Specification:
By secondary structure, the protein is mainly α. The chain is built from 13 helices and no strands. GO terms for molecular function: RNA binding; structural molecule activity; zinc ion binding.
Length: 288
Amino acid sequence: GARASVLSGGELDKWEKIRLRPGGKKQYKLKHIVWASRELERFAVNPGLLETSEGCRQILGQLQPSLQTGSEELRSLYNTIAVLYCVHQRIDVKDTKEALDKIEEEQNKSKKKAQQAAADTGNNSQVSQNYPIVQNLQGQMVHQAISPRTLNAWVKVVEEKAFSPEVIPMFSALSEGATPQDLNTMLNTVGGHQAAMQMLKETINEEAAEWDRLHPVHAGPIAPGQMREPRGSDIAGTTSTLQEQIGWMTHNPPIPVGEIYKRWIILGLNKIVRMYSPTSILHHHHHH
């Protein structure tokens, strides 16, 4: 009966401009909001948090876990707040589920910032660290690096058709079973599109993650000094050095460390080319 304070004029129009559950054919209302906030109070949480996007965040935040401990009804409550959060951010939504995906992106965005900070942390409780040391050992075999003559050759290749199906093979040829220091050098001298190179890095990096994902590392008490099993990251040169790389490559048995990384590049370049391809055709085929 008149009198209220939760959603704004336009903000409310957005809230109400969101269909509830699918198959219900119901639109959100201030009543649902009140009920939403009401549920919060029941959860022993400040209902005034729903009045603001900040408080809503704290809820939805501490609701994700309570969701798996809440119930079907409690879930709907969370879905209600989620949508509200979208209205706060003003994300293009239509249904409650849409908010989940919408708010999802936003969250992943925010959390990102946090992560970034945590990285270059500054104002927070820190702890000291130690610095161990061990005698340096000598590996085996010494592979030669890449020459500048080849780099130039590739450079010409890139300038020829950096992005193309006739370049993917050409590059792999000049990078035939190459290392990270070599492949990195070549990819360095490259020059076609940073954007393309960016995505390639994503596919490459993703290749390692996926590799390790499908690569179950279950090595017990390996021998002392033995050559453990390097993961996609290791092959990337993050957990392994060039020396260790070439070695792992020429190890017994020999592991396609460099080959794996090389294939990664081809993977990306493949997508890069598939993107800069001359009027490509559509295609699709899968098994259910």
